[PDB]
Amino acid sequence: TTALVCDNGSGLVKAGFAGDDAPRAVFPSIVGRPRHQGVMVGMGQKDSYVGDEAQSKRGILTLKYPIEHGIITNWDDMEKIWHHTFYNELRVAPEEHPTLLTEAPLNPKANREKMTQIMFETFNVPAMYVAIQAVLSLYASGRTTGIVLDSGDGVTHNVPIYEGYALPHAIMRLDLAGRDLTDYLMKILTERGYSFVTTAEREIVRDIKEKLCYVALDFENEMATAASSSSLEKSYELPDGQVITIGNERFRCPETLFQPSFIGMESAGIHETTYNSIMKCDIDIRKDLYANNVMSGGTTMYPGIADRMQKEITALAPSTMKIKIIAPPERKYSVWIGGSILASLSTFQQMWITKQEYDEAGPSIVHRKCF
């Protein structure tokens, strides 16, 4: 019996079977509900739209994200997300397939309680397990030691592991990722004359952020270059046919990852978070940590981020260390791909939470069994 890997991220649900490069269902985690007066009768009008169907008809819908910063708020919407990704995207019964689920660290435990109760009572499985995303990222990296910076759409977390031993006191969580960058890009696109206020326009701002933005190596030199000459300005076409051109906003938007005070937040950037997570570890393993930095998630897909992060850590680390950052082209789905590693492992078959253990222990064995 093949297992299931379902990364339920804040932005994109990535679901599929065991042992694939791409997740079989990659779609944004949105539930659409109509906000206008339906005047035509019949023609297959639906009260809700999930996935790319909501993306297609987004002009006449209000889109809701059931997951915000790794914590699921609306649960009936999350049940609709799971029912759509089981019965329609993958078209398989949940009663005959074990399902590995991912989780951000330092998540509230009631979220684990409710996903265990819903997964064992609404979409009742033979077994399910709740795992950490950074461990799967280190699996997909193909190594054992190293520090992982995961950055999805709600959660950016740093986890250091040495020889298979994670350090739970050194795990750091930062609620700053691509949704906050999309909101900041909405805030700074208003400067050039372009207004985007609705939830349907969030997809357009996210598409602009995905296509045109990049990470600058030196911030102030790129400010001087953008202010002096318009060589950095690039164009984009909206679906209504309008043409926009952006300059410095190509590299002001991801800079909030390296400078969180742009959106008004006290905590430090991702390179200071990486460095402080390194120095919280014991002193002997740090040389192994500096040469094995791992980035995963879609937020580190800008084509300037590895050289900038190397420059910042080499500024922070002492000069006798080789700062090597692993930045594969496959790192957008590597959180899923290491889930293909762990679910296919022969040593993982005894660690699943079965139906019977849930039946004596209630929905509380998931704390003592998982991380």
Partner: peptide, 23 residues
């Protein structure tokens, strides 16, 4: 030890890597 001395003198990885190419 004496009966032991008497009785003597007498893959996950390639399986997943094949199927990642299917997408």
């Amino acid at each position: 030890r004496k009966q032991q001395l008497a009785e003597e003198e007498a893959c996950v990885i390639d399986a997943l890597l094949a199927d990642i190419r299917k997408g």
